[PDB]
């Protein structure tokens, strides 16, 4: 019966994640025990997988790193952790990952991606970028009335 | 000519002929009839003729404008009668549209056309709300779009875009309060008109 072939596929996900500990780690971190092909890994530790037999939308996914920029992300993962070069591939704006089509290097491009910093001391605070418009007269420092 | 909208002379002639037809039948009320270059017919009437003219166009066998597509007002402050009242009507029998226009000022009532079209009910409430034109013999004339107690008629050309009052929740009185409007960034007025004439055909005589 196919019930046996289904159960076997279930058991191969356990070995496909490196035994029970690895199978349970992805179950609790990502709520998904699917096994895919490793497309690549970014410098922050995120890993990118594909399975083209899944339906469009489920055929690409990222298992986030457990630590990024000094933050514990074992449980607290965020969509803003995906760096731009992989962002394009993960959202299917392109077919080819940065491992096959690397981005163009520029001197000014951030070498270190930052995730959403709202709510932290690194948050953006707005302010006016223009200088003072009117200069006040400063009275003399000596007396003469 | 690929980029130019094609003319339709046949429809222009038909609509012109019908425009004279209306003017001949209701000379008491019709002041002007015109057909635009994109073939839309406008009947300009004295305000006394709203009910007779609209009834004729709804009921006459050669009109049968059974559907009131829209009813609205335009504010033109330079005119003695600043408000132009526009009726847009549709005839399904003859697959045609006609526009009926009249005028009023801030103190002269217009006759409610609810007897002719039940659709007019809310349109006239909106005209009263946004422009302050009073319609006589309306079954229930009152504001429809603005806040309760709202002062003024926002769609008048001299009503400021951002109004006079704004709302916020005040904790001391534990309710929403209205206060004079202050904007962190003033709306930036732009002067866009080119100093060069664009359309000679519409030049006005000096």
């Amino acid at each position: 019966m196919e019930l046996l072939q289904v159960l076997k596929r279930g058991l191969q996900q356990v070995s496909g994640h490196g035994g029970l500990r690895g199978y349970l780690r992805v179950l609790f971190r990502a709520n998904d025990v699917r096994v895919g092909t490793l497309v690549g890994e970014d410098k922050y530790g995120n890993k990118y997988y594909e399975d083209n037999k899944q339906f469009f939308g489920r055929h690409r996914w990222v298992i986030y790193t457990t630590e990024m920029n000094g933050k514990n992300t074992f449980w607290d993962v965020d969509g803003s952790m995906v760096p731009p070069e992989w962002h394009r591939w993960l959202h299917c704006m392109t077919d080819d990952p940065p491992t096959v089509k690397p981005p163009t290097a520029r001197k000014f491009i951030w070498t270190n991606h930052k995730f959403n910093l709202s709510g932290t001391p690194q948050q953006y605070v707005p302010y006016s970028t223009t200088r003072k418009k009117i200069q006040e007269w400063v009275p003399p420092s000596t007396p003469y009335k | 000519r690929p980029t130019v909208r094609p003319r339709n002379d046949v429809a222009h002639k038909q609509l012109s002929a019908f425009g004279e037809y209306v003017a001949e039948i209701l000379p008491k009320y019709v002041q002007q009839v015109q057909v635009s270059c994109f073939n839309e017919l406008e009947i300009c009437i004295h305000p006394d003729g709203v009910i007779p003219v609209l009834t004729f166009l709804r009921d006459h066998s050669n009109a049968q404008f059974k559907s009131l597509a829209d009813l609205t007002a335009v504010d033109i402050p330079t005119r003695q009668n600043r408000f132009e009242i526009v009726y847009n009507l549709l005839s399904l029998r003859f697959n045609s549209r006609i526009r009926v226009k009249t005028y009023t000022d801030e103190l002269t009532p217009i006759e409610s056309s609810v007897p002719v079209y039940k659709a007019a009910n809310w349109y006239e409430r909106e005209i009263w709300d946004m422009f302050g034109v009073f319609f006589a013999n309306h079954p229930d004339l009152r504001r429809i779009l603005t806040d309760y107690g709202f002062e003024g008629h926002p769609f008048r050309k001299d009503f400021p875009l951002s109004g006079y009052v704004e709302l916020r929740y005040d904790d001391e009185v534990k309710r929403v309060v209205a206060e004079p409007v202050e904007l962190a960034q003033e709306f930036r007025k732009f002067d866009l008109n080119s100093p060069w004439e664009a359309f000679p055909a519409y030049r006005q005589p000096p």
């Binding site: - | 000519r1 038909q14 015109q34």
Partner: protein, 94 residues
């Protein structure tokens, strides 16, 4: 697409349709997310001669309305009466 043969039979029977032919989940039939560059055509006004703008200036052919009567024989309708619609032959009745 991953359903077992039994489960495909069960849901086809319950719905009464051949669901597997028209799956609502997309697979490889979708177009590639990287495409070759386009080369779009240009319009009729892309010419080097016989192309003066005053011969294709639609805005300047607009005119003020024709005043047919100003306050200063057979009856007519605004247009000919509308033609009766004809019942569809594709499927006149649901």
């Amino acid at each position: 697409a991953s359903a077992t043969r039994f489960i495909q039979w069960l849901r086809n029977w319950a719905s009464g349709r051949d669901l597997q032919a028209k799956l609502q989940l997309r697979y490889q039939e979708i177009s590639k997310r990287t495409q070759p560059p386009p080369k779009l055509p240009v319009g009729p006004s892309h010419k080097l001669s016989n192309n003066y703008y005053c011969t294709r200036d639609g805005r300047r052919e607009a005119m003020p309305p024709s005043i047919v009567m100003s306050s200063q024989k057979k009856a007519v309708s605004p247009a000919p009466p509308i033609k009766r619609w004809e019942l569809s032959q594709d499927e006149p009745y649901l």
